[PDB]
Amino acid sequence: SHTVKIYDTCIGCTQCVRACPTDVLEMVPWDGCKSGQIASSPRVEDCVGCKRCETACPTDFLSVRVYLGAETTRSLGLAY
Amino acid sequence: EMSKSIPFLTVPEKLDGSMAGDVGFDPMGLSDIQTDLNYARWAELKHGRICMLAVVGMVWQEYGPHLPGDAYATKDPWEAISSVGFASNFQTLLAIGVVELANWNKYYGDGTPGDIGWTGGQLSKMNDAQIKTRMESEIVHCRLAMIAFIGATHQTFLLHKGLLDFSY
Amino acid sequence: ATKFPKFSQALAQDPATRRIWYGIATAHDLEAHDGMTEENLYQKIFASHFGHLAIIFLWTSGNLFHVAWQGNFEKWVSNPLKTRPIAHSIWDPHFGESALKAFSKGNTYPVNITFSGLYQWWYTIGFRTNQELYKGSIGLLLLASVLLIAGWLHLQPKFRPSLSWFKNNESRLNHHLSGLLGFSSLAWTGHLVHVAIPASRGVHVGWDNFLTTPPHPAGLTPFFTGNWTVYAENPDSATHVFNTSEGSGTAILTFLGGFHPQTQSLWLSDMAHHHLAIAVVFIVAGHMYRTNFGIGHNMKEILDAHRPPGGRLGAGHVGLFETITNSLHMQLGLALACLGVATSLTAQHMYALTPYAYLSKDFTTEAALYTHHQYIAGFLMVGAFAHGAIFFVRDYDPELNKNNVLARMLEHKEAIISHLSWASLFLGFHTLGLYIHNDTVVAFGQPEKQILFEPLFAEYIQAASGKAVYQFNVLLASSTSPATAAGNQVWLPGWLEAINNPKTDLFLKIGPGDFLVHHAIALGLHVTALILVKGALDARGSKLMPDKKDFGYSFPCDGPGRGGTCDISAWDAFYLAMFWMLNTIGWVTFYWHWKHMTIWGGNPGQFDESSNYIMGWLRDYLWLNSSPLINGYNPFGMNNLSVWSWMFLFGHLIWATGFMFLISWRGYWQELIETLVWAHERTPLANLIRWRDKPVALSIVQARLVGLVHFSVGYILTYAAFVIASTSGKFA
Amino acid sequence: VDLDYGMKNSYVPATGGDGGQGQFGAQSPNDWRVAGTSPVGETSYAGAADGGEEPWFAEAISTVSLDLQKADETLKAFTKDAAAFKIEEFAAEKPYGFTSSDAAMEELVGKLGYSKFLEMSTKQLMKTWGT
Amino acid sequence: AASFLPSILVPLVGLIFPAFSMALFFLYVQTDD
Amino acid sequence: GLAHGYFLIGPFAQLGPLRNSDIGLLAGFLSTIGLILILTLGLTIYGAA
Amino acid sequence: SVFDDAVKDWAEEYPQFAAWGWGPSVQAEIWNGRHAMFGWVVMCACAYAKGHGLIPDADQTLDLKEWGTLATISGKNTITNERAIILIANVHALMVGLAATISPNSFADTLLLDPNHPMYEWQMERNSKLGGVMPNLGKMGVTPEAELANGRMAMMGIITCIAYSGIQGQSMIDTINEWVGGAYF
Ligand code: CLA
Ligand code: CLA
Ligand code: CLA
Ligand code: CLA
Ligand code: CLA
Ligand code: CLA
Ligand SMILES: CC(=O)O[C@H]1CC(C)(C)C(=C=C/C(C)=C/C=C/C(C)=C/C=C/C=C(C)/C=C\C=C(/C)C(=O)C[C@@]23O[C@]2(C)C[C@@H](O)CC3(C)C)[C@](C)(O)C1
Ligand SMILES: CC(=O)O[C@H]1CC(C)(C)C(=C=C/C(C)=C/C=C\C(C)=C/C=C\C=C(C)\C=C\C=C(/C)C(=O)C[C@@]23O[C@]2(C)C[C@@H](O)CC3(C)C)[C@](C)(O)C1
Ligand SMILES: CC1=C(C#C/C(C)=C/C=C/C(C)=C/C=C/C=C(C)/C=C/C=C(C)/C=C/[C@@]23O[C@]2(C)C[C@@H](O)CC3(C)C)C(C)(C)C[C@H](O)C1
Ligand SMILES: CC1=C(/C=C/C(C)=C/C=C/C(C)=C/C=C/C=C(C)/C=C/C=C(C)/C=C/C2=C(C)CCCC2(C)C)C(C)(C)CCC1
Ligand SMILES: CC1=C(C/C=C(\C)CCC[C@H](C)CCC[C@H](C)CCCC(C)C)C(=O)c2ccccc2C1=O
Ligand code: SF4
Ligand code: SF4
Ligand code: SF4
C-alpha cells in the first residue's frame, strides 16, 4: 500500500519503530552511524499512513518518509 | 528527382510511378504527411465519377428528352432540385447512403483503391498491363470531368447562358 | 485494470467507495493514466477537442431552434421596444393552474423570457424571419456531426497525427493568425457588407439573391481602381430609421464614430471597416514564421538572442522554447490567462460601446451579460495560475532553465510574495478604515465629517478623451489641442457627441464614491493574486516541506507534526483563492449593478451619497431592491418572478450546505459511518442485502472540493436571481 | 503451513504509488464480497455457519479460530530461519564439544525453551552450552 | 402534430433516460471485467 | 409483494395531487404501479451485480 | 452487405448489449415483428372506430380540474378524449408486456437471452436456423419460420404506410382506409 523509505541520515534512535501503531518498522544492524543501527520497513502492507513515525524523527529533515499511495482494507483501517 | 509534369521542381517521394496517373504532380507536397495515398485515390475516383455523371446530366437536361410529367421538365439544372421535390431527392439520397455504408470497409481498407466490385465483365481476361491502361483511362477521364464541372457551373452562374450556347 | 477506473490499477484495486469517486474526478487527467505515451496523449486530446467543438455547435443550434419554434422573434423585429423576447416554452406537470396563467402573461402559453441578448445580436446581423433561424440551426447540426466524424477519423490507425505534427509551432501560428483570425474577419466584413447593412436599410439579401444584388452601387470598380473613398460617401442620415430605407445611405465602409441616433448602437458601416482593417493586420502577421518555404523567423532563435546586455535579467529567455513546447500545462495557463483578460474586456467595452441595437434599452439583459462574462473571467484567471503551478511541480526542468528569466523568478520568490503582502495590507487597512470612518460619522449624524477623495486621475483620463463636465481643459477637451485638430474632421465629431451625452454609458460620470470601490477591487485582485502566486512559487518546496515536489500538486497534508501541515499543497492555494475570486467579482458586479440601477431609475444621487459608507450598500441596494424578489410568491398569490424567488432561497441552501464540508472534517464522519455499518449488518431482513463497495467517509481533499462547489454554485445562483428579478421587477 | 498462503492473493502491485505485498501479503486470499443472509435451512457464504433457527444472525456465529496446539506450529515455522541463523552463529564460534546443528538446537532449546532461545545472544548461548 | 412533442419527450428525457443511464453506470462500476 | 403493494396505494390515494378528484383512486393505483416498477428495476440491477 | 459481417462488427463495438440479444439479432427481429403484426390490428381498429364514430365523445378535451396539468398539451389546453382513449388501450397492452418481461414463465420465450432461463437452449437453436433472405416455404402453418416471415412483412408495411402517407400528403389512417377500399370510412 503506502511507501516508507529510510535515508542515510538515520541515527538509530529507534524512536520511529517505537511509535508505529502497526509494527511496520524494525531496527536492523548497520555501520553508517555511531549507534550501529538503521531502521527498515519490512511490513509496509500494514502501514495506515499515520505519520507518527515522521513526527518522532529527530533529524533535520525526516530520515523516514511516508508517501501515501494505493489504499487497501488494512491501510484504510477498516475493521468492518 | 525532377518532376516530369513540372520540369523545374523536385518530385515528392511517394509519387514513384506505381499508381496510375502519376505524372509526378504534387507541387504543394500534400503527399508527405499522408501514410499512403489509398484514401486519397478513392476520393479522387469518387469525386471524378460523380462529376462525370454530373456534366453529362447537365447537358442532357438542358438539351435532351426529359422524363414524362411536369415538375420534371425544368431545363435549368439548379431549379430542378426544388421542382422535383423532397420526396424524389430523399429517395436518391437514401439509396446512395446504403451503398456508401455497405462499402465502408472498402473505403477505409487496404484493397485496390476504387474497386467496389462493379467491374462488369470488363477488366477480365486481360493482363496486368492492360488492366493498368484501363485504370489510367478512368483517372484521366475523372480529372477532365472535375475540371469541366467547375467550368460548366461557373459559366452558368456568371454568364447565365446555356452550356452549348457559344455566342460572342 | 478490471474495475471502473480502467486507467488506474491503484484505484481499481481499492475495496471502498473511493474507487468510484476518484475514478470520475481523475478521468480527464490523461497524463497520469496507467501506460500513457506522449504520442497517445496528444492524439486523444486532439480528438477530445473535436467533441467539445461539437457540443458548442449543438448548443448554438438549440437556441436558434427553440427561438424559431417557440419564440416571438418576428413580432419583436416589428416592435423591438415593446415586446419581451421569448427563450423557450414551459411544460412542467407540477405547475398549478395559477402558475400556468402567470408565466403565460403577454402570450398564449407558459414561457420563459430570455436575458441572453440573442434577439438583438441576430437582429443586428441580419436575421428577420423565423425560417432563416431554422436554416441556421439545421446547418449547425450538420456541422456538429462532421466534427464528430473527424474525432473518430483522427483516432484511426492511418490518420493519427504524429507527435512532430503536434509540435510544429511555426506552421500552426502562421495558419491560426492568418487564417483562423485574419481570413475569418475578412469573411465577416463580407457578410456585414452583403447582408447586414442592406437589411438595416430595408433591403433583403439572402442566398436567393446575393449573387445578383451588388452591395454597393459603384461595384468593385472603386476597389481595384484605388478610389476607395467612394465606399465611404453618403453615410446614413441622422434621421435614418433602422430596418427601413427612410434616411438611408449607400456607404459601406466608414469611420463616423459614435452611435446610431435611433438604435443607440455602433454604426454597422464602422464595424465592417473595423473587421476589414483587423483582417489585414492579422493576415500580414501570419507571415512571420518559417514554414517549409525558406522565408520566416525561427522562434527558438528569437528567444535565445534576447538577453539584456547589462545582465540584469540573467541569461535572458534561453531555454524557454523547449520548456513551453514540452509542457502542455504552461501552454494552457498562458491561454487561459489571455482569454480571461479578453472576457473581462468584452464585459467592460460592451456596456459602454453598445454593439447591438436596442440592447441598451433592455436593462435586465445588459445586467446579466456583464455579470456573466465577469464571472467566467474570474474562473478563467484562477485556472491559469492553477495550471502554472501544476507546471512547476510536474514539467519544470531546473537544469534546462539555468539562470533563465523563469528560474530567477523562483529565486526572489520571497521578495515577490512579501511585497504583494504589503500591498494587500496597505489597501486593506485604509480602504476599510475610511469606510468605517464614514459610517461612524454619518451614524452620529455628522455627514460633513466624511473623508471623500475625488477620483481626479480617472476624471482626467475621461477629459482627455473629450468629457467636459470635470472642466479639465486637456487634450480632446481642449479646442486648441493639437489632438483635437487632428481628428476634428475624422471621427471626433461623432465621438465628442456621445462622450458628452449624459444618457450614454460612454465614460459614465465618476465621483468620490467610485474612488473607494475601485480601491476595494484593487484589494481583491492583489489578495487573490497573492494566494495564487504563492501557491505556484511554493509548489516545488518550502521550509516546512522542502520535498513537496515529490508528493505532487494535490495531497491531503504532511501530518500533524512539525507544527501541523494542513492545506500545505498547491492545490489548496487554488481552493483558498476561489473564495477570494468570488468575493472580488462580487464586489465588481455589485458596483456595476447599483450604479446602473440608480441611473436607470433616474436618481443617480442615491449612489453618489450612500456609496460612501457600508450601510448604504446594505440598505439602499440589497434591502431596497430585494422587495420584488422576496414577493415572487406570498400568502396572497404568485407572479412570473416565482421561479426566480425560489431559486434565490435554493442558492442560500446550497451555499450553507457547503459550510458543513468546509468546517467539519473526516474523523468525525468516519466514526459515525462505522456505527451505521454495524446496524445494517445486525438488523434482520435488511441483512439480506449487502454492499459490494465498503462504505467509507469522503477524503480530505474530496470534501474540500465538494464544499467549494457547493459554496460556488449557491453563490452564483443566488446573485443570478437577484440581478434578474430586481432589475426586471422594477424596470420591466 | 503454507507460509505463502497470504502472499498468494489476487492483489497485483501497481507501477508507482504502492508498497507492494510487503512481508505477509497485502490482502486476504479470500474475497470479502460475499452475499447476505439466507432463509432457514440454507447457506450463503460458501463455508458459512448454519444459522439454525436464527439465520438472521448467522454472521455472528464464529467458525474461524486458533488452535493453541496449531499456534505452536505456526510460531515455529515462521521463525525457522531466524533459529537457523542463531544456531549457525553459535556453531561458528567454536562450540565446546559440538555435535550437530540440529542436535545442538534440541539441547539448547530443551533448556531455555524455544522463545528464550530466539531471544538470546550467541554469547549467552555459548555460556549456556558450556556444559 | 409537433405541438404534442413537449408532452411526449419531456416525460422520457427527465425520467426514463436518467434512470436507464444510472442503472448502466451502476452495472458498469460493479462489474469485474 | 402481496404485503407491500396493499399498503402503498393508501399514501398516494389520500394525499396525492388528484386526491379530491373523482379519479383520485385510479390515479393512486397508477402511481403505486410506477413505484413498484422502480423498485423492481432496483431488484434486477442488484441481482446482476 | 453480407449482413453477417455488419452484425459481427456491431457485436464487437457493443459487446455487452449483444450478449443479451440486443441490437441486430434474430431475437429482436422476432419480437419487433410480433409487435408490428399486433399493431396493424390496433391501427386498423382505430381507423374503423374513427370512421364509424365509435369512440365516445371524441374531439373534446379532458377537464383540467378532474385530471391534472399532466393532461395539458400547451398552457391550459388539454388532450382530446380520442387520443386519451387510444393511449389507454395501448397501456392495457404494455402492462401485459411488462409482466411478461419481468415475470417470465418456465416455458416462455423471454425477451432477452438469459443463460439461467430454462428456454435458453431452445431459443438459441431456433434463432440459429431462422435466418435467410427468402421466406422458407414448406414450413407453413404455425412454425417459427412463418412467424418471422409475417413479422418482416408487417414491419415493411409500417414503413410503406408512412412513406405513402407523406408522398400523398395524407394521414396514415386515411391511407389505411384507402388500401382497404374505403371500407372503414
Ligand atoms: C450526378 C448525377 C445526377 C444527379 C444528381 C441528377 C439529378 C436530377 N436529374 Mg438527372 N441525369 C443525369 C445525372 C444526374 N441527374 C445523367 C447522367 C443523365 C443522362 C442519362 C440525366 C438525365 C436526366 C433527365 C432526362 C432528367 C433528369 C432529371 C433530374 C432531376 C430529377 C431526378 C430524375 O428524374 O433523374 C432522372 C435520372 C435519370 C434519367 C438517370 C440518372 C442516371 C444515373 C445517375 C445512373 C447512375 C446510377 C448509379 C450508377 C447506380 C445507382 C446508385 C445508387 C443509388 C444505387 C434531378 C435534379 C429530371 C428532371 O429534369 O427533373 C426536373 C429529368 O427529366 N436527369
Ligand atoms: C474542360 C474545361 C473547359 C472547357 C472545354 C471550356 C470551354 C469554354 N469556356 Mg470555360 N471555363 C472553365 C473550363 C472550361 N471551359 C473553367 C474551369 C472556368 C472557370 C471557372 C471557365 C470559365 C469560363 C468563362 C468565364 C467563360 C468560359 C467560356 C468558354 C467558351 C469559350 C472559351 C474561349 O473563348 O476560350 C478561348 C481560348 C483562348 C482565347 C485561348 C486559347 C486556348 C489556349 C491558348 C490553348 C487551348 C488548347 C487546349 C488544349 C484546350 C483543349 C481542351 C478542350 C478542347 C477540351 C468555351 C465553350 C466563355 C464563353 O463565352 O463561353 C460561353 C466565357 O465567357 N469559360
Ligand atoms: C480549457 C480549459 C481546461 C482544460 C483543458 C483543463 C484540463 C485539466 N485540468 Mg483544469 N482548470 C481549468 C480549465 C481547464 N482544465 C480552469 C478554468 C480551472 C479553474 C477552476 C481549472 C482548475 C483545475 C484544477 C484545480 C485541477 C485541474 C486539473 C485538470 C486536469 C484534470 C481534470 C480532471 O481531472 O477533471 C476530471 C473531471 C471532473 C473533475 C468533473 C468535473 C465536475 C465538476 C467539478 C462539478 C460540476 C459542477 C456542478 C455539478 C454543477 C451542478 C449544479 C446544479 C445543481 C445546478 C486536466 C488536464 C486537475 C489536475 O490535477 O491536473 C493536473 C486539478 O487538480 N484544473
Ligand atoms: C470579512 C472577512 C475577512 C476579512 C476581513 C479578511 C482579512 C484578510 N485576509 Mg482573508 N479570508 C477570508 C475572510 C476574510 N479575510 C475567508 C473567508 C477566506 C477563505 C478563502 C480567506 C482567505 C485568505 C487568504 C488565503 C489570505 C487572506 C488574507 C487576508 C489579509 C489581507 C491583507 C489585508 O486586507 O490587510 C488588512 C486587513 C484588514 C483590514 C483586516 C483586519 C482589520 C483589523 C480590524 C485592524 C484594523 C486597523 C484599523 C485600520 C486601525 C488601525 C490603528 C488602530 C490600532 C489604532 C486580511 C487580514 C491574506 C493575508 O494573509 O494577508 C497578507 C491571504 O493570503 N485571507
Ligand atoms: C421531467 C421529469 C419529471 C416529470 C415528467 C414528472 C412528472 C410528475 N411528477 Mg414528478 N418529480 C421529478 C421529475 C418529474 N416528475 C423529480 C426530479 C422529483 C424529485 C424532486 C419529483 C418529485 C415528485 C413528487 C414528490 C410527486 C411528483 C408527481 C408527479 C406527477 C404529477 C402529475 C399528476 O397527474 O400526478 C398524478 C399521477 C398520475 C396521474 C400517475 C401518472 C402515471 C405514472 C407517472 C406512471 C409512472 C410509470 C413509469 C414509467 C415508471 C418509471 C420506470 C423507470 C424505469 C423510469 C407527474 C406524473 C406527484 C405524483 O402524483 O406522482 C405520481 C408527486 O407526488 N413528482
Ligand atoms: C419529507 C416531508 C414531506 C412530506 C411528509 C410530504 C408529503 C406529501 N407531499 Mg411533498 N415534498 C417535500 C416533502 C414532503 N412532502 C419536499 C421536500 C418537496 C420538494 C421536492 C416536495 C414536493 C412535492 C410535490 C411536487 C408533490 C408532493 C406531494 C405530497 C403528498 C403526496 C404524498 C405521497 O405521494 O407520498 C407517498 C408516500 C409513500 C409511498 C410512503 C410514505 C412513507 C410511509 C408511510 C412510511 C411508513 C413507515 C412505517 C410506519 C414504519 C413502521 C412499519 C412497521 C409498523 C411494520 C403528501 C402530502 C404531492 C401532492 O399532491 O402534494 C400534496 C405532489 O405533487 N410533494
Ligand atoms: C404515376 C405514374 O405512374 O406515372 C409516372 C410516370 C413517369 C413519367 C415515369 C414519372 C416519372 C418520373 C420518375 C418516377 C422518376 C424517377 C426518378 C429517379 C428515381 C431518379 C434518380 C435516381 C438518381 C440516382 C440513382 C443518381 C445518382 C447516383 C449516383 C450519382 C452515384 O454516384 C452513386 C455512387 O455509386 C457511384 C456510381 C459510385 C460510388 O463509388 C459512389 C456512389 C455510391 C455515390 C411520373 C410523371 O413522375 C409519374
Ligand atoms: C511590422 C509590420 O507590420 O510591417 C509590415 C507592414 C506591411 C505594410 C504589412 C508590409 C507590407 C506589405 C507592403 C509592400 C506594404 C506597403 C504598402 C501597401 C499598404 C501596399 C503596397 C503597395 C501599394 C501600392 C503600390 C499602391 C497602389 C495604389 C494605387 C495604384 C493607386 O493609388 C490608385 C489611385 O492612383 C489612382 C489610379 C488615381 C488616384 O486619384 C486614386 C489613387 C491614388 C488611389 C511590410 C512592409 O512588408 C511589413
Ligand atoms: C446501411 C446498412 C444496411 C442496411 C440497411 C437497412 C435497409 C436498414 C433498415 C432497417 C429498417 C428499416 C428497419 C425497420 C424497422 C421497423 C420496425 C422495427 C418497426 C417496428 C414497429 C413496431 C414495434 C410496431 C409498433 C406498434 O404496434 C405498437 C407498438 C402500437 C400500435 O399502436 C402501433 C404500432 C403497430 C406501430 C445493410 C445494407 C443491410 C448492411 C450495411 O452494412 C449497413
Ligand atoms: C503562474 C504561472 C503562469 C501564469 C502567469 C500568469 C497568469 C500571468 C498573467 C499575467 C497578466 C494577466 C498580465 C497582464 C498584463 C497587462 C498589461 C501588460 C497591460 C498593459 C497595458 C499597456 C501596455 C498600455 C495600454 C494602453 C494603451 C495601448 C494606450 C494608452 C492607454 C493604455 C493604458 C490603455 C504560467 C502559466 C505562464 C507559467 C509560469 C507561472
Ligand atoms: C457528511 C459528510 C460525509 C459523508 C457524506 C456522504 C457519505 C455522502 C453520501 C451521499 C452521496 C450523495 C453519495 C450517495 C450515492 C448513492 C448511494 C448512489 C451511488 C450510485 C453509484 C453508482 C455512484 C463525509 O464523508 C465527510 C468527509 C470529510 C469531511 C466532511 C464530511 C461530511 O461532512
Ligand atoms: S506511517 Fe504509521 S504505520 Fe506507517 S510506518 Fe509510520 S508509524 Fe508505522
Ligand atoms: S526516528 Fe529518524 S533518526 Fe531515529 S531511528 Fe527513526 S528514522 Fe532514524
Ligand atoms: S490534514 Fe490531518 S494529519 Fe495533516 S496536519 Fe491536518 S490534522 Fe494533521
Distance CA G52, CA C172 (A): 71
One-letter amino acid at C3 equals: K
Distance CA A63, CA C492 (A): 73
CB atoms under 10 Å from CB of B96, counted, come to 11
C-alpha cell at C121: 445580436
Q: Which atom of ligand 11 is nearest to the CA of E29?
A: 22
For D127, the 3-state DSSP assignment is helix
One-letter amino acid at C602 equals: G
b/e D42-79 (16+ beta carbons within 10 angstroms → b): eebbeebeebeeebbebbeeeeeeeeeeeeeeeeeeee
Residues in chain C: 732
Concatenating the DSSP letter of every residue in C60-128 gives HHHHHHHHHHH--HHHHHHSTTS-PPEEEE---TT--HHHHHHTTTTSSS-EEE--S-HHHHHHHHT--
b/e A5-27 (16+ beta carbons within 10 angstroms → b): ebeeebbbbebbbebbeeebbbb
Distance CA C91, CA C111 (A): 9
CB atoms under 10 Å from CB of C727, counted, come to 24
Q: Do C104 and G75 meet the contact criterion of CB atoms below 8 Å apart?
A: yes
Q: CB of C227 closer than 6 A to ligand 8?
A: yes
The yes-or-no reply on E/B contact (3 CB pairs or more, < 8 Å) is no
- Helices and strands, number each (H, E), in chain C: 30, 4
| CA-to-CA separations, E21 to E17, E24, E25, in angstroms, rounded | 6, 5, 6
Alpha helices in D64-129 (DSSP H): 68-78, 80-92, 101-110, 115-118, 122-128
Q: Mutate which of G92, G95, G102, G112 to test chain F, going by most F C-beta atoms within 10 A?
A: G102
Phi, psi of A64 (to 5 degrees): -115, 120
CB atoms under 10 Å from CB of D88, counted, come to 11
**Cα dihedral sign for C330, C334, C335, C336?**
positive
Chains that touch B (3 or more CB pairs under 8 A): C, G
Considering only CB atoms, which chain C residues are within 8 Å of G66? none
Distance CA D72, CA C678 (A): 34
Distance CA E6, CA B126 (A): 64
Q: CB of A50 closer than 6 A to ligand 12?
A: yes
Which residue has the least CA distance to atom 32 on ligand 11? C661
For C566, the 3-state DSSP assignment is strand
Residue C660, marked binder: yes
**Which helix (H) or strand (E) is C583 found in, with range?**
helix C570-601
Distance CA G76, CA C47 (A): 47
Distance CA B35, CA B18 (A): 16
- Helices and strands, number each (H, E), in chain B: 5, 0
For C452, the 3-state DSSP assignment is coil
Q: Do F23 and G66 meet the contact criterion of CB atoms below 8 Å apart?
A: yes
* Chain centre to alpha carbon of residue C708: 19
For chain C, report the end-to-end CA distance as a whole number of angstroms.
Answer: 58
Distance CA C366, CA C360 (A): 7
Q: Mutate which of C14, C22, C544, C700 to test chain A, going by most A C-beta atoms within 10 A?
A: C14
Residue C305: half-sphere exposure toward Cβ, Cα within 13 Å: 6
Q: At what angle do helices C363-394 and C328-352 cross, to 10 degrees?
A: 160
Distance from CA of C293 to the nearest CA of D (A): 46
CB atoms under 10 Å from CB of G92, counted, come to 9
CB atoms under 10 Å from CB of C576, counted, come to 18
Concatenating the DSSP letter of every residue in G131-166 gives --SS--TT--SSSHHHHHHHHHHHHHHHHHHHHHHH
Q: Do C629 and C657 meet the contact criterion of CB atoms below 8 Å apart?
A: no
Closest CA to C86 of C114, C115, C125: C114
Q: Taking the CA atoms of chain E, what radius of gyration do you get in angstroms?
A: 14
Q: Taking the CA atoms of chain A, what radius of gyration do you get in angstroms?
A: 13
**DSSP secondary-structure letter at E3?**
G
**DSSP secondary-structure letter at C565?**
-
Q: Taking the CA atoms of chain G, what radius of gyration do you get in angstroms?
A: 21
- Residues with Cβ within 6 A of ligand 4? C 421, 424-425, 428-429, 432-433, 527, 530-531, 576, 579-580
Considering only CB atoms, which chain B residues are within 8 Å of C211? 157
Distance CA E1, CA E8 (A): 11
Q: Do C723 and C590 meet the contact criterion of CB atoms below 8 Å apart?
A: no
| CA-to-CA separations, F25 to B113, C37, F11, F36, G55, in angstroms, rounded | 69, 63, 11, 17, 24
Closest CA to C585 of C343, C361, C421, C337: C343
Residue C443: half-sphere exposure toward Cβ, Cα within 13 Å: 10
Q: Do D8 and D26 meet the contact criterion of CB atoms below 8 Å apart?
A: no
One-letter amino acid at C34 equals: D
Q: Mutate which of E7, E25, E28 to test chain G, going by most G C-beta atoms within 10 A?
A: E7
* Chain centre to alpha carbon of residue C70: 28
Give the position of cell 405547475: C95
The yes-or-no reply on G/B contact (3 CB pairs or more, < 8 Å) is yes
Distance CA D66, CA D71 (A): 7
Query: Is G65 an 8 Å CB contact of chain F?
Result: yes
Give the pairing of strands C86-89 and C111-113. Answer: antiparallel
**Cα dihedral sign for C105, C111, C112, C118?**
negative
Dmax over CA atoms of chain D, in Å, equals 69
**DSSP secondary-structure letter at B11?**
P
Resolution in A: 3.2
Q: Do C661 and A67 meet the contact criterion of CB atoms below 8 Å apart?
A: no
Residue A33, marked binder: no
Resolved by: cryo-EM
Cβ contacts from C onto D, under 8 A: 32
Distance CA C504, CA C354 (A): 9
Query: Is E3 an 8 Å CB contact of chain C?
Result: no
Distance CA C464, CA C483 (A): 10
Distance CA C445, CA C437 (A): 12
Q: CB of B101 closer than 6 A to ligand 9?
A: yes
Query: What residues are paired with C418 via a beta bridge?
Result: none
C-alpha cell at G18: 449483444
C-beta atoms of C156 and B108 within 8 A: yes
Chains that touch A (3 or more CB pairs under 8 A): C, D
Closest CA to C607 of C288, C599, C228, C730: C599
Give the position of cell 512547476: C392
Closest CA to G174 of G165, G52, G43, G154: G165
